[PDB]
Amino acid sequence: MFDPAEKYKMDHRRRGIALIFNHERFFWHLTLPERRGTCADRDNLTRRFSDLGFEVKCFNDLKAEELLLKIHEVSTVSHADADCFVCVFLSHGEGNHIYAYDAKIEIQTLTGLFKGDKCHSLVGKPKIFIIQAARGNQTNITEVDAASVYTLPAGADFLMCYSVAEGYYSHRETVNGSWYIQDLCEMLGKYGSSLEFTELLTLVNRKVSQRRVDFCKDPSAIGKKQVPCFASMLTKKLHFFPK
Amino acid sequence: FYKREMFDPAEKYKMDHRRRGIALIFNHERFFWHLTLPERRGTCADRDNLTRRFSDLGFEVKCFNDLKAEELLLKIHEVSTVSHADADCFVCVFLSHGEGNHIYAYDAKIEIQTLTGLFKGDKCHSLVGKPKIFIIQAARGNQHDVPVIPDTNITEVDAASVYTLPAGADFLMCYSVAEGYYSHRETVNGSWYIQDLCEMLGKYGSSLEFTELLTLVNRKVSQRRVDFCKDPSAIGKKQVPCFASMLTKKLHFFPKS
């Protein structure tokens, strides 16, 4: 019988794995600026997801090959005992690509590793990608980057979450971290274990979009609004109730 | 509370206005021969289905069939320049073929961003902070017809071709199909996506949070299979819809007082 309020079964032994790929520096040949404040983001995300029951694993400044290797490895182990899978990318990006330390990687090749055919044990389970990546511009300072990464979906039961949409600007405080991640972690901390996750993501939309850009320490950044977005191909309601 | 103040996890868009708003439907069944695009039989069923559903939700529905690009732009520019001060929200539906950032009018294609850009910010002040909902049934027209000018229920299968992009704060962009998948349309019953959308609207539209309803449509469509026995090039051409939300509050269509 069709249930209008059906929920993903979050009954399994483990919540699941949460991967964080953190990129603060890039090979000089790429000519990309450092991302000060990204370590605050990584730490913030680690605490939130960990409190949600996730097994969190972080990797700092991996080369492209090492990154592919690691995520392929994760995609080929069994997730039969897990509720879901989370993957977070903290870097710069361009169009369909995100930057590793030495080269860029296609987002689709990363998400494709978890598509039903390649990862049977995640079939029918939420696969959540959180992407903080924009165009690298070539005390607590706020750095403003233009949106650059296409806010695309990824397949059934995938949820793709983006820090910023085309036409808007991503912000990152060198001490406090990224606007998007801060607001995301805040909402996770307060409401993560009760609220339906796309409703929580909507709160993050509101929170970030309301951050005022009329008076900036840097007059260059005045009026450069930030609005996030998410592209959902989930098929059920997603909650992270305490296990 | 006794009165309200600070950040509320359950804040809803105010759906308190005199009118629900306008719902535009742009319906395209045929195309100028030079575009070499196939007809879209079944789209009129889609148009009628959507009209009854949105009308029951209180929308003022206006349909336009097979408009040329210039006429289309003119009409949507006209809607974007009137006052929506007495409206809760705005809905715009495209039923056509498309490619990348483009949707096809009768004689040419139009960039989606130029369409949505008309309702951004102070370009349309009276819709600022209000849900602006675009529903797009558009994919790649199978082009095994000629660049010359020339009753049963068949299911047509089209590859996803339109980028599933977002559009600005308080915009919700709804797509029949995502990249890598296929859109289906029955020549009599209409599009898989629109049928399931309309069925969920009818049954749940007037109480369910609209993105939660869209998620129901994701599940419904993703679970459909074509009859093998029956015509079977369609095996394994799965359809999975998606929506890109930049909404900032919960969206409901409770019956208006």
UniProtKB/Swiss-Prot annotation, chain A:
Post-translational modification: Phosphorylated by NUAK1; phosphorylation inhibits self-activation. Phosphorylation at Ser-209 by AMP-activated protein kinase (PRKAA1 or PRKAA2) inhibits autocleavage, preventing caspase activation, thereby preventing hepatocyte apoptosis.
Subcellular location field: Cytoplasm; Nucleus
Regulation: During activation, the N-terminal disordered prodomain is removed by cleavage. Concomitantly, double cleavage gives rise to a large 18-kDa and a small 11-kDa subunit. The two large and two small subunits then assemble to form the active CASP6 complex. Can be cleaved and activated by different caspases, depending on the context. Cleaved and activated by caspase-8 (CASP8) and subsequently by caspase-3 (CASP3).
Catalytic function, reaction form: Strict requirement for Asp at position P1 and has a preferred cleavage sequence of Val-Glu-His-Asp-|-
Region (130's region): 96-113
Transmembrane portions of the chain: none
Record note on what altering residue 106 to Q does: Increased stability
Pfam families named among the record's database cross-references: Peptidase_C14 (PF00656)
Phosphoserine found at: 50, 209
EC code: 3.4.22.59
GO CC, alphabetical: cytoplasm; cytosol; nucleoplasm; nucleus
Catalytic-site annotation from UniProt: 92, 134
Region (Tri-arginine exosite): 13-15
S-palmitoyl cysteine: lipidated positions: 216, 229
CDD domains: CASc
Keywords: Apoptosis, Autocatalytic cleavage, Cytoplasm, Hydrolase, Lipoprotein, Nucleus, Palmitate, Phosphoprotein, Protease, Thiol protease, Zymogen
GO biological process: activation of innate immune response; apoptotic process; cellular response to staurosporine; epithelial cell differentiation; hepatocyte apoptotic process; intrinsic apoptotic signaling pathway by p53 class mediator; positive regulation of apoptotic process; positive regulation of necroptotic process
Reported effect, residue 209 to A: Abolished phosphorylation, leading to caspase-6 activation
Matches recorded under PANTHER family: CASPASE, CASPASE-6
Note on domains (UniProt): The N-terminal disordered prodomain is required to prevent self-activation.
Family: Belongs to the peptidase C14A family.
Protein name as annotated: Caspase-6
Protein encoded by which gene: CASP6
